[PDB]
With several copies, the nearest count.
Chain A
């Protein structure tokens, strides 16, 4: 009669590492590292992401002709640019505080586009047509931004213009506009008609006075002239007043914004699909409850802490010794 004390074993081939010894076969163990994604960009809370396509934030918000599919967009879970998002600012020039504007869009869940200054009723004393360019061509013909209006002189006359807008939308109104800088003094007259023009813009927290920087520059997209893009969030109840004697790319359409955390902008070439997830990465979605993942640093939703590790297996059972 005997009795022996011993321990468990099995066919498990799971190896873990310790500080003293590597590749130690154990009987049980949990994996802490998620490394399997979806390969697909999915919805979040049932709401689909916004594909920009061959367009970037600038193009979309400005109304670049190549970005007409996006005119419909009103709500999104997150915004997605790609490797080919190059259609942004078709007329050469600076987009002042562009990176900052993007940072703002990051906390926007949706907006309500609207005509802030109706093109066919806001400018009785100025040329509302003729404001097109080969740089912004559409369908083979010269065109322009869909959300902006390039004003010009009405038969050799450009009377000072004043035009205000009061915010009654009960939210922030994103107002964009531009100031044109001709190459020569000749073009300045042909366009505006006043050689010494100016553009002034004022709200409760915004006050700035732009003046034409006439100069000769290398042609970019066939333009020696430049166009500088500006913006501002108009607060609920606040007025914004435009004054100009020329060079004004007036706002046509605006955006009444809706805030919402948990949003953001990613760059991905992965395809969008009709699926739902609580975690999104540039490579794909993640359906897991593991503490870690080595897929991607960039994340949207509730995700596991990103880590460089290749393997994070922690032991739960004992050292495995079948000794058959």
Chain B
């Protein structure tokens, strides 16, 4: 990844999380489970849905486009006309493919960036009250319950602390 999150410091994705693109695991004394982040997943969908629509608008459709006949003394005109059709075909085929190739790179890097920005929104929310294991995982110091979890995946932590060295 260009931001090293996806296929990076978070080696894999969760087939278990099926309600969003990005989310949390959270293992508690009350149970496990998965939870997708509305905030960030919606923004992506709106962004991607917008990217696709922008591409389509730009590629105007094609109206009645038929060919022309030329007699045996109009070879220069027949070839000219043929040079134009193949000329425009070359260009549009180029633009079409080239555009997808580029945007696909931008889209995958987009998701990468999103996962990264999420991880670090959590990290700067917890600070001391937890430690970074590895695979994008935080281990709690102050024991957080199901009610407390939903305060983190909400952008509203509270930081009542003590630690445990």
Decide if A3 is an interface residue (CB 8 Å cutoff): yes
A1 touches B28 (CB 8 A): yes
Q: From B115, which residue of chain A is reached at the shortest CB distance? A: A7
Chain B 106-146, CB-CB to A under 8 Å as 1, else 0, gives 11101110010011001000000010010111111001100
Q: Which of B60, B122, B144 contacts A305 (CB 8 A)?
A: B60
Q: How many residues of A contact B (CB 8 A)?
A: 67
B64 touches A103 (CB 8 A): no
B52 touches A2 (CB 8 A): no
Decide if A316 is an interface residue (CB 8 Å cutoff): yes
Q: Which of A3, A308, A309 contacts B138 (CB 8 A)?
A: A3
B96 touches A292 (CB 8 A): yes
B6 to chain A: closest CB distance in Å?
Answer: 6
B10 touches A5 (CB 8 A): yes
A18 touches B105 (CB 8 A): yes
Report if A30-B52 is in contact (Cβ < 8 Å); known contacts: A8-B21, A18-B108, A104-B75: yes
Chain A 29-60, CB-CB to B under 8 Å as 1, else 0, gives 01010000000000000000000000000000
Report the separation of the CA atoms of residues A307 and B60 in the bound assembly, to the nearest whole angstrom.
Answer: 13
Report the separation of the CA atoms of residues A26 and B21 in the bound assembly, to the nearest whole angstrom.
Answer: 12
A3 to chain B: closest CB distance in Å?
Answer: 4
Please give, as numbers and ranges, the residues of chain B lying within 8 Å of A266 by CB-CB distance. 66
B15 touches A2 (CB 8 A): no
B12 touches A32 (CB 8 A): no
Report the separation of the CA atoms of residues A22 and B75 in the bound assembly, to the nearest whole angstrom.
Answer: 43
A318 touches B21 (CB 8 A): yes
Report the separation of the CA atoms of residues A106 and B67 in the bound assembly, to the nearest whole angstrom.
Answer: 10
Report if A307-B24 is in contact (Cβ < 8 Å); known contacts: A20-B47, A20-B48, A264-B64: no
Chain B 67-94, CB-CB to A under 8 Å as 1, else 0, gives 1111111111001000001000100110
Decide if B159 is an interface residue (CB 8 Å cutoff): no
State which residues 85-132 of A face B: CB under 8 Å: 97-100, 102-104, 106
Decide if A303 is an interface residue (CB 8 Å cutoff): yes
Report if A3-B24 is in contact (Cβ < 8 Å); known contacts: A19-B101, A305-B92, A324-B15: yes
